Coordinates of C-alpha atoms in Angstrom, one line a residue:
Chain A
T1 CA 10.6 7.9 -5.6
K2 CA 9.9 4.1 -5.4
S3 CA 12.2 2.1 -7.6
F4 CA 10.7 0.2 -10.5
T5 CA 11.2 -3.6 -10.3
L6 CA 10.2 -6.8 -12.2
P7 CA 9.1 -10.1 -10.7
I8 CA 11.9 -12.8 -10.7
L9 CA 9.6 -15.4 -12.3
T10 CA 10.8 -17.7 -15.1
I11 CA 8.7 -17.9 -18.2
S12 CA 7.2 -21.2 -17.1
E13 CA 6.2 -19.6 -13.8
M14 CA 4.0 -17.0 -15.5
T15 CA 0.4 -16.9 -16.9
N16 CA -0.9 -15.6 -20.2
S17 CA -2.8 -12.4 -19.6
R18 CA -5.2 -13.0 -22.6
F19 CA -6.2 -16.6 -21.7
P20 CA -5.9 -18.6 -18.5
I21 CA -3.0 -20.8 -19.5
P22 CA 0.7 -20.8 -18.7
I23 CA 3.3 -19.0 -20.8
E24 CA 5.3 -21.5 -22.9
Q25 CA 7.7 -19.4 -25.0
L26 CA 9.2 -16.0 -25.7
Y27 CA 8.5 -15.2 -29.4
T28 CA 9.3 -12.2 -31.4
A29 CA 7.7 -11.4 -34.8
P30 CA 7.0 -8.3 -37.0
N31 CA 3.6 -6.7 -36.9
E32 CA 3.2 -7.4 -40.5
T33 CA -0.4 -6.2 -41.2
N34 CA -1.8 -6.9 -37.7
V35 CA -2.9 -4.1 -35.5
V36 CA -1.6 -5.2 -32.1
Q37 CA -4.3 -3.8 -29.9
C38 CA -5.3 -6.5 -27.4
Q39 CA -7.3 -5.3 -24.4
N40 CA -6.5 -7.9 -21.8
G41 CA -3.0 -7.8 -20.3
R42 CA -2.7 -4.1 -20.7
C43 CA -1.0 -2.1 -17.9
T44 CA 1.4 0.8 -17.8
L45 CA 4.7 0.4 -16.0
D46 CA 3.4 2.7 -13.2
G47 CA 0.4 0.4 -12.6
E48 CA -2.5 1.8 -14.5
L49 CA -4.8 -1.0 -15.9
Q50 CA -6.1 -0.4 -19.3
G51 CA -8.7 -1.9 -21.7
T52 CA -10.6 -4.8 -20.2
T53 CA -7.7 -5.8 -17.9
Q54 CA -8.2 -7.1 -14.4
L55 CA -6.1 -9.0 -11.9
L56 CA -7.4 -12.6 -11.9
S57 CA -6.4 -15.1 -14.6
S58 CA -9.4 -17.1 -13.6
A59 CA -11.6 -14.3 -14.8
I60 CA -10.1 -14.0 -18.3
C61 CA -12.6 -15.3 -20.9
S62 CA -14.9 -16.2 -18.0
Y63 CA -18.6 -15.1 -18.0
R64 CA -21.5 -15.4 -15.6
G65 CA -25.1 -14.4 -15.6
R66 CA -28.6 -15.6 -16.3
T67 CA -29.6 -17.6 -19.4
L68 CA -32.4 -16.4 -21.6
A69 CA -33.9 -18.6 -24.3
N70 CA -33.4 -17.3 -27.8
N71 CA -35.1 -18.2 -31.1
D72 CA -32.0 -18.7 -33.2
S73 CA -30.4 -21.8 -34.8
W74 CA -26.9 -20.8 -33.7
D75 CA -27.4 -18.9 -30.3
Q76 CA -30.1 -21.0 -28.7
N77 CA -29.6 -18.9 -25.5
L78 CA -28.3 -15.6 -24.5
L79 CA -26.3 -14.9 -21.3
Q80 CA -27.3 -11.7 -19.5
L81 CA -24.0 -10.8 -18.0
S82 CA -23.7 -10.1 -14.3
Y83 CA -20.8 -9.0 -12.1
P84 CA -19.2 -11.7 -9.9
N85 CA -21.4 -10.4 -7.0
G86 CA -24.5 -11.0 -9.0
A87 CA -25.6 -7.4 -10.0
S88 CA -26.4 -6.7 -13.6
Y89 CA -23.5 -5.3 -15.7
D90 CA -23.5 -1.5 -16.2
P91 CA -22.8 -0.4 -19.9
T92 CA -21.9 3.1 -18.7
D93 CA -18.6 1.9 -17.2
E94 CA -15.6 3.5 -18.9
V95 CA -14.4 0.2 -20.3
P96 CA -14.6 -1.5 -23.7
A97 CA -16.5 -4.4 -22.2
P98 CA -16.8 -6.3 -18.9
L99 CA -13.3 -6.9 -17.5
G100 CA -11.9 -10.2 -18.8
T101 CA -14.0 -10.2 -22.0
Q102 CA -12.3 -12.1 -24.8
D103 CA -10.3 -9.7 -27.0
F104 CA -9.8 -11.9 -30.0
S105 CA -12.1 -12.5 -33.0
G106 CA -13.5 -16.0 -33.6
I107 CA -15.0 -18.8 -31.5
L108 CA -14.3 -19.3 -27.8
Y109 CA -15.1 -22.7 -26.5
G110 CA -15.9 -23.6 -22.9
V111 CA -18.3 -25.3 -20.4
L112 CA -21.4 -23.8 -19.0
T113 CA -22.6 -24.9 -15.5
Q114 CA -26.0 -24.1 -14.1
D115 CA -28.3 -25.2 -11.2
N116 CA -27.0 -28.4 -9.7
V117 CA -28.9 -31.6 -10.8
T118 CA -29.6 -34.8 -8.9
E119 CA -27.2 -37.6 -9.1
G120 CA -29.7 -39.7 -11.1
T121 CA -29.9 -37.1 -13.8
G122 CA -26.7 -38.6 -15.3
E123 CA -23.0 -38.0 -15.7
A124 CA -21.9 -34.3 -16.3
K125 CA -25.6 -33.3 -16.9
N126 CA -24.8 -29.9 -15.4
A127 CA -22.1 -29.3 -18.0
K128 CA -22.8 -27.9 -21.4
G129 CA -20.3 -27.4 -24.2
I130 CA -20.6 -23.9 -25.6
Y131 CA -19.4 -21.9 -28.6
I132 CA -19.2 -18.1 -28.0
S133 CA -18.6 -16.6 -31.4
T134 CA -17.7 -12.9 -31.8
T135 CA -19.1 -13.0 -35.4
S136 CA -22.6 -13.7 -34.1
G137 CA -24.9 -10.7 -34.0
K138 CA -25.6 -11.6 -30.4
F139 CA -22.0 -10.9 -29.1
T140 CA -22.6 -7.6 -27.4
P141 CA -20.8 -7.8 -24.1
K142 CA -20.6 -4.0 -23.7
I143 CA -24.4 -3.9 -23.8
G144 CA -24.5 -6.8 -21.3
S145 CA -25.4 -9.9 -23.3
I146 CA -23.7 -12.6 -25.4
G147 CA -24.9 -15.5 -27.5
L148 CA -24.3 -19.1 -26.4
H149 CA -24.3 -21.9 -29.1
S150 CA -24.8 -25.3 -27.4
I151 CA -23.0 -28.3 -28.7
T152 CA -23.3 -30.9 -25.9
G153 CA -26.0 -30.8 -23.1
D154 CA -29.2 -28.8 -22.7
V155 CA -28.9 -25.2 -21.6
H156 CA -31.8 -24.3 -19.3
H157 CA -33.6 -21.0 -19.5
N158 CA -33.5 -18.5 -16.6
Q159 CA -30.8 -20.1 -14.5
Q160 CA -27.8 -18.5 -13.0
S161 CA -24.9 -19.8 -15.1
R162 CA -21.1 -19.7 -15.2
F163 CA -18.9 -20.1 -18.3
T164 CA -15.5 -21.7 -17.9
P165 CA -13.2 -21.2 -20.9
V166 CA -11.3 -24.1 -22.4
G167 CA -10.0 -23.0 -25.7
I168 CA -10.9 -21.6 -29.2
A169 CA -12.4 -23.2 -32.2
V170 CA -12.2 -22.7 -36.0
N171 CA -15.1 -23.9 -38.2
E172 CA -15.6 -23.6 -41.9
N173 CA -16.3 -19.8 -41.9
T174 CA -14.9 -18.4 -38.6
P175 CA -11.1 -18.2 -38.5
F176 CA -9.3 -17.4 -35.3
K177 CA -7.9 -13.9 -35.5
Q178 CA -6.1 -13.0 -32.3
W179 CA -5.3 -9.4 -33.4
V180 CA -8.8 -8.5 -34.7
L181 CA -10.7 -6.9 -31.9
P182 CA -14.3 -8.0 -31.4
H183 CA -17.1 -5.5 -31.8
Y184 CA -18.0 -5.3 -28.1
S185 CA -21.4 -3.6 -28.9
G186 CA -22.0 -5.6 -32.2
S187 CA -23.1 -3.4 -35.0
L188 CA -25.0 -1.0 -32.7
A189 CA -22.1 1.1 -31.7
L190 CA -18.3 1.5 -32.1
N191 CA -15.8 0.2 -29.6
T192 CA -14.9 2.6 -26.8
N193 CA -12.3 3.1 -24.1
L194 CA -9.7 1.0 -26.0
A195 CA -6.1 0.5 -24.8
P196 CA -3.9 1.9 -27.7
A197 CA -2.3 -0.2 -30.4
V198 CA 1.4 -0.9 -30.0
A199 CA 4.2 -1.2 -32.6
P200 CA 8.0 -1.0 -32.8
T201 CA 9.1 2.4 -33.9
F202 CA 12.9 1.9 -34.1
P203 CA 14.2 0.1 -37.2
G204 CA 15.4 -3.4 -36.5
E205 CA 13.1 -3.8 -33.5
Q206 CA 10.2 -6.2 -33.2
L207 CA 7.7 -6.8 -30.4
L208 CA 8.6 -9.6 -28.0
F209 CA 5.5 -11.7 -27.1
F210 CA 4.8 -14.0 -24.2
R211 CA 3.4 -16.9 -26.2
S212 CA 1.1 -19.8 -25.3
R213 CA -0.5 -22.6 -27.3
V214 CA -4.3 -22.3 -26.7
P215 CA -6.3 -25.6 -27.1
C216 CA -8.3 -25.7 -30.4
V217 CA -11.4 -27.9 -30.2
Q218 CA -12.2 -27.7 -33.9
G219 CA -10.0 -26.9 -36.9
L220 CA -6.4 -25.9 -37.3
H221 CA -5.3 -29.5 -38.1
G222 CA -1.6 -30.1 -38.0
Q223 CA -0.7 -26.7 -36.3
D224 CA -0.8 -25.1 -32.9
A225 CA -3.1 -22.2 -32.2
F226 CA -1.3 -19.3 -30.5
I227 CA -2.3 -16.6 -28.2
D228 CA 0.4 -13.9 -27.7
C229 CA 0.3 -11.3 -24.9
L230 CA 2.4 -8.2 -24.3
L231 CA 2.8 -8.7 -20.5
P232 CA 2.3 -11.8 -18.4
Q233 CA -0.5 -11.5 -15.8
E234 CA 2.0 -11.6 -13.0
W235 CA 3.7 -8.5 -14.4
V236 CA 0.4 -6.7 -14.7
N237 CA -0.4 -7.5 -11.0
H238 CA 3.1 -6.5 -9.9
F239 CA 3.0 -3.1 -11.6
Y240 CA -0.5 -2.6 -10.1
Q241 CA 0.8 -3.3 -6.6
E242 CA 4.0 -1.3 -6.8
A243 CA 2.9 1.7 -8.9
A244 CA 6.5 2.8 -9.2
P245 CA 6.8 6.1 -11.2
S246 CA 8.2 5.8 -14.7
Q247 CA 11.3 8.0 -15.0
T248 CA 11.5 7.8 -18.8
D249 CA 9.5 6.3 -21.7
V250 CA 11.6 3.1 -21.9
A251 CA 13.0 0.8 -19.2
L252 CA 16.0 -1.2 -20.3
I253 CA 15.7 -4.8 -19.1
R254 CA 18.1 -7.7 -19.3
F255 CA 17.3 -11.4 -19.6
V256 CA 19.9 -13.1 -17.3
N257 CA 21.2 -16.3 -16.0
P258 CA 20.3 -15.8 -12.3
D259 CA 23.2 -18.0 -11.1
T260 CA 25.9 -15.8 -12.7
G261 CA 24.1 -12.6 -13.6
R262 CA 25.3 -12.9 -17.2
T263 CA 23.1 -11.2 -19.8
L264 CA 21.7 -13.4 -22.5
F265 CA 19.9 -10.6 -24.3
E266 CA 18.6 -7.1 -23.6
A267 CA 15.2 -5.6 -24.4
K268 CA 13.2 -2.4 -24.2
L269 CA 10.2 -2.3 -21.8
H270 CA 8.1 0.6 -22.9
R271 CA 6.1 2.7 -20.4
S272 CA 2.7 1.7 -22.0
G273 CA 3.4 -1.9 -21.2
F274 CA 5.1 -3.8 -24.0
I275 CA 8.6 -5.1 -25.0
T276 CA 10.7 -4.8 -28.1
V277 CA 13.9 -6.6 -29.0
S278 CA 16.5 -6.2 -31.8
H279 CA 15.8 -9.0 -34.2
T280 CA 14.6 -9.4 -37.8
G281 CA 12.2 -12.3 -38.6
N282 CA 9.9 -14.7 -36.8
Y283 CA 11.9 -16.1 -33.9
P284 CA 11.0 -18.5 -31.0
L285 CA 13.7 -17.8 -28.4
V286 CA 15.9 -20.5 -27.1
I287 CA 16.5 -19.8 -23.5
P288 CA 17.5 -21.7 -20.3
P289 CA 14.5 -22.6 -18.1
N290 CA 15.9 -20.7 -15.1
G291 CA 16.4 -17.4 -17.0
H292 CA 14.4 -14.3 -16.1
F293 CA 14.2 -10.6 -16.8
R294 CA 15.9 -7.9 -14.7
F295 CA 15.4 -4.2 -14.7
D296 CA 18.6 -2.4 -15.7
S297 CA 17.9 1.4 -16.0
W298 CA 15.8 4.0 -17.6
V299 CA 16.7 5.0 -21.2
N300 CA 15.4 6.8 -24.2
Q301 CA 12.9 5.5 -26.8
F302 CA 15.7 5.3 -29.5
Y303 CA 18.3 3.5 -27.4
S304 CA 20.2 1.1 -29.7
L305 CA 19.7 -2.5 -28.4
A306 CA 22.3 -5.2 -28.9
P307 CA 21.1 -7.6 -31.6
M308 CA 19.7 -10.9 -30.3
Chain B
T1 CA 16.1 -7.9 8.1
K2 CA 13.9 -7.8 5.0
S3 CA 10.4 -6.8 6.2
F4 CA 7.4 -9.1 5.9
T5 CA 4.5 -7.8 3.9
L6 CA 1.1 -8.8 2.4
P7 CA -0.3 -7.8 -1.0
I8 CA -3.1 -5.2 -0.8
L9 CA -6.0 -7.1 -2.3
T10 CA -9.7 -7.5 -1.5
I11 CA -10.9 -11.1 -1.3
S12 CA -12.6 -10.8 -4.7
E13 CA -9.1 -10.0 -6.0
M14 CA -7.9 -13.4 -4.7
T15 CA -7.7 -16.8 -6.3
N16 CA -8.4 -20.1 -4.6
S17 CA -5.1 -22.1 -4.3
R18 CA -6.8 -25.5 -4.5
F19 CA -9.0 -24.8 -7.6
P20 CA -8.7 -22.2 -10.3
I21 CA -11.6 -19.9 -9.2
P22 CA -11.8 -16.6 -7.4
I23 CA -12.3 -16.4 -3.6
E24 CA -15.9 -15.6 -2.6
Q25 CA -16.0 -15.7 1.2
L26 CA -14.0 -16.1 4.4
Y27 CA -15.1 -19.0 6.6
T28 CA -14.1 -20.4 10.0
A29 CA -15.1 -23.7 11.5
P30 CA -13.7 -26.4 14.0
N31 CA -11.8 -29.3 12.5
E32 CA -14.0 -31.7 14.0
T33 CA -13.1 -35.0 12.3
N34 CA -11.5 -33.5 9.2
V35 CA -7.7 -33.8 9.0
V36 CA -6.8 -30.5 7.3
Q37 CA -3.8 -31.5 5.2
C38 CA -4.4 -30.1 1.8
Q39 CA -1.3 -30.1 -0.5
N40 CA -2.0 -27.2 -2.8
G41 CA -1.8 -23.7 -1.4
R42 CA 1.0 -24.6 1.0
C43 CA 3.8 -22.1 1.6
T44 CA 5.6 -20.8 4.6
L45 CA 5.7 -17.1 5.4
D46 CA 9.4 -17.0 4.3
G47 CA 8.6 -18.4 0.9
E48 CA 9.1 -22.2 1.0
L49 CA 6.6 -24.1 -1.1
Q50 CA 5.3 -27.4 0.3
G51 CA 3.3 -30.4 -0.9
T52 CA 2.2 -30.2 -4.5
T53 CA 2.1 -26.4 -4.5
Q54 CA 3.3 -24.4 -7.5
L55 CA 2.9 -20.8 -8.6
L56 CA 0.3 -20.8 -11.4
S57 CA -3.4 -20.9 -10.6
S58 CA -3.9 -22.0 -14.2
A59 CA -2.0 -25.2 -13.3
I60 CA -4.1 -26.2 -10.3
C61 CA -6.0 -29.4 -11.1
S62 CA -4.7 -29.3 -14.6
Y63 CA -3.0 -32.3 -16.2
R64 CA -1.0 -32.9 -19.4
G65 CA 0.7 -35.9 -21.0
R66 CA 0.0 -38.7 -23.5
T67 CA -3.1 -40.8 -23.5
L68 CA -3.1 -44.5 -23.8
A69 CA -6.1 -46.9 -24.2
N70 CA -7.1 -48.9 -21.2
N71 CA -9.3 -52.0 -21.2
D72 CA -11.7 -50.9 -18.4
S73 CA -15.3 -49.9 -18.3
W74 CA -14.6 -46.8 -16.2
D75 CA -11.1 -45.7 -17.1
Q76 CA -11.2 -46.2 -20.9
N77 CA -7.8 -44.4 -21.1
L78 CA -4.9 -43.4 -18.9
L79 CA -3.0 -40.1 -19.0
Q80 CA 0.7 -40.5 -18.8
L81 CA 1.7 -37.4 -17.0
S82 CA 4.2 -34.7 -17.3
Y83 CA 4.7 -31.8 -14.9
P84 CA 2.2 -29.1 -15.7
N85 CA 5.0 -27.0 -17.1
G86 CA 5.8 -29.8 -19.5
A87 CA 8.9 -31.0 -17.8
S88 CA 9.4 -34.8 -17.7
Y89 CA 7.8 -36.2 -14.5
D90 CA 10.4 -38.1 -12.5
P91 CA 8.6 -40.2 -9.8
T92 CA 11.8 -40.1 -7.7
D93 CA 11.3 -36.4 -7.1
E94 CA 10.6 -35.4 -3.5
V95 CA 7.0 -34.5 -4.1
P96 CA 3.7 -36.2 -3.2
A97 CA 2.7 -36.1 -6.9
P98 CA 3.2 -33.8 -9.9
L99 CA 2.7 -30.2 -8.8
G100 CA -0.9 -29.0 -9.1
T101 CA -2.4 -32.5 -8.7
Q102 CA -5.8 -32.4 -7.1
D103 CA -5.7 -32.7 -3.4
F104 CA -9.4 -33.6 -2.7
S105 CA -11.1 -37.0 -2.8
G106 CA -13.9 -37.6 -5.3
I107 CA -14.5 -36.9 -9.0
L108 CA -12.8 -34.0 -10.9
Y109 CA -14.6 -33.0 -14.1
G110 CA -12.9 -31.2 -17.0
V111 CA -12.2 -31.2 -20.7
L112 CA -9.4 -33.0 -22.5
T113 CA -8.0 -31.6 -25.7
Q114 CA -5.7 -33.6 -28.1
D115 CA -4.3 -33.3 -31.6
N116 CA -6.2 -30.7 -33.6
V117 CA -8.9 -32.1 -36.0
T118 CA -10.1 -30.9 -39.3
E119 CA -13.0 -28.5 -39.4
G120 CA -15.2 -31.2 -41.1
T121 CA -14.7 -33.5 -38.2
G122 CA -17.4 -31.5 -36.3
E123 CA -18.1 -29.0 -33.6
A124 CA -15.8 -29.4 -30.5
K125 CA -14.7 -32.8 -31.7
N126 CA -11.2 -32.1 -30.1
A127 CA -12.9 -31.7 -26.7
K128 CA -13.7 -34.7 -24.5
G129 CA -15.6 -34.5 -21.2
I130 CA -13.7 -36.4 -18.6
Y131 CA -14.2 -37.7 -15.0
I132 CA -11.0 -38.1 -13.0
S133 CA -11.9 -40.0 -9.9
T134 CA -9.4 -40.5 -7.0
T135 CA -11.2 -43.7 -5.8
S136 CA -10.3 -45.4 -9.1
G137 CA -7.4 -47.8 -8.8
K138 CA -5.8 -46.0 -11.8
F139 CA -5.4 -42.7 -9.9
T140 CA -1.7 -43.0 -9.3
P141 CA -0.2 -39.6 -10.3
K142 CA 2.9 -40.2 -8.1
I143 CA 3.7 -43.3 -10.2
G144 CA 3.1 -41.2 -13.3
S145 CA -0.5 -41.7 -14.6
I146 CA -4.2 -41.2 -13.9
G147 CA -7.3 -42.8 -15.1
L148 CA -9.7 -40.9 -17.5
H149 CA -13.4 -41.7 -17.6
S150 CA -14.8 -40.2 -20.8
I151 CA -18.4 -39.0 -20.9
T152 CA -18.6 -37.1 -24.2
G153 CA -16.2 -37.4 -27.1
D154 CA -13.7 -40.0 -28.4
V155 CA -10.4 -40.0 -26.6
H156 CA -7.6 -41.0 -29.0
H157 CA -4.6 -43.2 -28.2
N158 CA -1.1 -41.9 -27.8
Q159 CA -1.7 -38.2 -28.3
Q160 CA -0.2 -35.3 -26.4
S161 CA -3.2 -34.1 -24.4
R162 CA -4.2 -31.4 -21.9
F163 CA -6.9 -31.5 -19.2
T164 CA -8.6 -28.3 -18.3
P165 CA -10.5 -28.5 -15.0
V166 CA -14.1 -27.2 -14.8
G167 CA -15.6 -28.5 -11.6
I168 CA -16.4 -31.6 -9.5
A169 CA -19.0 -34.3 -9.7
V170 CA -20.8 -36.6 -7.2
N171 CA -22.2 -39.8 -8.5
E172 CA -24.1 -42.5 -6.5
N173 CA -21.0 -43.9 -4.7
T174 CA -18.3 -41.1 -4.9
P175 CA -18.9 -38.2 -2.5
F176 CA -16.8 -35.0 -2.7
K177 CA -14.5 -35.0 0.4
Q178 CA -12.3 -32.0 0.2
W179 CA -10.3 -32.9 3.4
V180 CA -9.7 -36.6 2.5
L181 CA -6.3 -36.7 0.7
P182 CA -6.1 -38.9 -2.4
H183 CA -3.7 -41.8 -2.3
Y184 CA -1.2 -40.4 -4.9
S185 CA 0.2 -43.9 -5.5
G186 CA -3.0 -45.8 -5.0
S187 CA -2.8 -48.9 -2.9
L188 CA 0.8 -49.7 -3.9
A189 CA 2.4 -47.1 -1.6
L190 CA 1.5 -44.6 1.0
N191 CA 1.7 -40.8 0.5
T192 CA 5.1 -39.2 0.7
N193 CA 6.6 -35.7 1.0
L194 CA 3.3 -34.3 2.5
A195 CA 2.9 -30.8 3.8
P196 CA 1.9 -31.3 7.4
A197 CA -1.6 -31.3 8.8
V198 CA -2.7 -28.1 10.5
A199 CA -5.0 -27.5 13.5
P200 CA -5.5 -24.7 16.1
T201 CA -3.6 -25.2 19.3
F202 CA -4.5 -22.1 21.2
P203 CA -7.7 -22.4 23.3
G204 CA -10.7 -20.8 21.6
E205 CA -9.1 -20.6 18.1
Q206 CA -10.2 -22.1 14.8
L207 CA -8.8 -22.1 11.3
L208 CA -9.8 -19.4 8.9
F209 CA -10.4 -20.5 5.3
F210 CA -10.5 -18.7 2.0
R211 CA -13.7 -20.2 0.5
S212 CA -15.0 -20.7 -3.0
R213 CA -17.9 -22.5 -4.6
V214 CA -16.7 -25.0 -7.2
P215 CA -19.1 -25.9 -10.0
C216 CA -20.7 -29.3 -9.7
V217 CA -21.7 -31.1 -12.9
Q218 CA -23.5 -34.0 -11.3
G219 CA -25.2 -34.3 -7.9
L220 CA -25.3 -32.0 -4.9
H221 CA -28.8 -30.9 -5.9
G222 CA -29.9 -27.9 -3.8
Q223 CA -26.4 -27.9 -2.1
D224 CA -23.3 -25.9 -2.6
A225 CA -19.9 -27.5 -3.3
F226 CA -17.2 -25.6 -1.3
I227 CA -13.4 -25.7 -1.7
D228 CA -11.6 -24.1 1.2
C229 CA -7.9 -23.2 1.1
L230 CA -5.5 -22.0 3.8
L231 CA -3.9 -19.2 1.7
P232 CA -4.9 -17.5 -1.5
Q233 CA -2.7 -18.2 -4.5
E234 CA -1.6 -14.6 -4.5
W235 CA -0.1 -15.0 -1.0
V236 CA 1.7 -18.1 -2.0
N237 CA 3.3 -16.2 -4.9
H238 CA 4.0 -13.1 -2.7
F239 CA 5.8 -15.1 0.0
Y240 CA 7.8 -17.0 -2.6
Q241 CA 8.9 -13.8 -4.2
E242 CA 9.7 -11.8 -1.1
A243 CA 11.2 -14.6 1.1
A244 CA 11.1 -12.3 4.0
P245 CA 12.6 -13.9 7.2
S246 CA 10.0 -14.9 9.7
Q247 CA 10.9 -13.1 13.0
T248 CA 8.6 -15.2 15.2
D249 CA 6.3 -18.2 14.6
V250 CA 3.2 -16.0 14.4
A251 CA 2.5 -12.8 12.4
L252 CA -0.4 -10.7 13.8
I253 CA -2.6 -9.5 11.0
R254 CA -5.9 -7.6 10.9
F255 CA -8.8 -7.3 8.4
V256 CA -9.7 -3.7 8.1
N257 CA -12.3 -1.5 6.5
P258 CA -10.0 1.0 4.6
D259 CA -12.6 3.8 4.6
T260 CA -13.3 3.8 8.4
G261 CA -10.0 2.2 9.5
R262 CA -12.0 -0.2 11.7
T263 CA -10.4 -3.5 12.5
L264 CA -13.2 -6.0 11.6
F265 CA -11.1 -8.8 13.2
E266 CA -7.6 -9.7 14.0
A267 CA -6.0 -13.0 13.2
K268 CA -2.8 -15.1 13.6
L269 CA -0.9 -15.8 10.4
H270 CA 1.3 -18.8 11.4
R271 CA 4.8 -19.3 10.1
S272 CA 3.9 -22.5 8.3
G273 CA 1.3 -20.7 6.3
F274 CA -2.3 -20.8 7.8
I275 CA -4.6 -18.5 9.7
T276 CA -6.4 -18.9 13.0
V277 CA -9.1 -16.6 14.6
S278 CA -10.8 -16.5 17.9
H279 CA -14.3 -18.1 17.3
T280 CA -16.3 -21.2 18.2
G281 CA -18.6 -22.7 15.6
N282 CA -19.3 -22.6 11.9
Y283 CA -19.3 -19.0 10.7
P284 CA -19.3 -17.5 7.2
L285 CA -17.8 -14.1 7.8
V286 CA -19.9 -11.0 7.1
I287 CA -17.4 -8.4 5.8
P288 CA -17.5 -5.4 3.5
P289 CA -16.3 -6.0 -0.1
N290 CA -13.5 -3.3 0.2
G291 CA -11.9 -4.9 3.3
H292 CA -8.3 -6.2 3.1
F293 CA -5.7 -7.7 5.4
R294 CA -2.8 -5.8 6.9
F295 CA 0.3 -7.0 8.7
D296 CA 0.7 -5.5 12.2
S297 CA 3.7 -7.2 13.9
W298 CA 5.4 -10.4 14.9
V299 CA 3.9 -11.8 18.1
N300 CA 4.7 -14.7 20.5
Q301 CA 3.0 -18.1 20.9
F302 CA 0.6 -16.9 23.7
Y303 CA -1.0 -13.8 22.0
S304 CA -4.7 -13.8 22.8
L305 CA -6.7 -12.7 19.8
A306 CA -9.8 -10.4 20.3
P307 CA -12.9 -12.6 19.8
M308 CA -14.7 -12.2 16.5

């Protein structure tokens, strides 16, 4: 039996598994009416990837394929999605959508690049600012196509194109809802192959999130936009490499000062890949920059954590 | 002795350590006039980071800090830098520049985001297209600031801002030179704290690179823009985590087809963190997509690799 371990990384040495940006904060909050069912950053403790989760942060909310002109005021072009090797996407794969597809509802903003242009064409002429909205009828990544709304630049028809994500956007009628899953097939079919929803079951416990501030290119004045993941990408990749068998349903872990080994707080790491702590209320944790989690032992799902 | 290991990954499961994009190819070539002294993706086999190397691919070529207006027709603003993890940048730190700073000469293109704006301000109005040129006299990241040439959008003064890299650009007088190090202090001072230059010393050997195509938003019509790194970011992170003692100066590795067990080629993984192979000339490797590297043993200085 290979022993279960965690990476020794500090929180600032880890990446959000739902958007390609660094983790900034540990944050615990109740679920209130949210269904916490994100599809990126989902991995069991014994290394089984779930949902739309893959290994590369540079593939999260990234798309590539061939552009196709579309007669619509919002989506002036569609993107026929292709695998990184170039082959067309296969909707029969047992996944909710292409791996790395955005798992939040609202507008994703980024830059499309296409066939290289001559130097004389002008500055950044092969860069197009794009809104990818999940509330558009053309957002059907499971079927292999998404809608591109151009803001800056001219998107050319029938060119191999790559989309690099930058942030999210909120306009007058499209709020950013990080816990509302997109309809990966639009209205044509229901979502499939989803990683399960997660929630604390033991009274007094709340989920502990790895929190990042995602750039917001429109809306949300005077407030930070947040994307919260259940596992950092480095933990997903570690469990995938190690594939250590899970001895019980819950691994007790301790957040420690690495110099002294002293425990700052303890938490429950559940076998399906999420963390709970004993706290009541919204809470951004105050922790030393050198602290990190350490696997302690395997316990039961109703172990009584020390309050933090 | 703790045993040295490699992560089990195909090359499409690897990230370029000099730009946040996946690896696409393996490539070997002679050094001819290039001084190979990149500063990102530098790590010894026993886990010692060098140059400007840090652990997050999402921090490579990313910048953050506060903008300030600048009376210049090219650099209309400067970015007063932090470290990419937000920690105050101290120019007396023993680093060439803030970790993750671009290590190629030319123009880096990306998107700047600033204080969030109201919805009514307009679509993507908190997104600014930016050229960051290393040939500008304002590219002095070691001193604590870089110049921002805005193409689209209005860069606001004295706002906490983030720069997300998208690709490179080539205008009429700024070629993309991936092996010409920037002057991190400009003309005021020479580069400091550099990871050493690398070159093959054994007869018949050449460096082996992990190669990606970087998007180019201006210029290089009909040509591909390549960024070559000495180690994938996943190997940097793995060596940092494991810190396995190096038993000799050279680790013999092999690239295998896991189905047939065939060694497609063997290579020297040097203690200072780079790979050499036995080949003469420019050669993009032809390899099956399921191939991966394996560690064989520690060898001496005069091991003769099988030609590939």
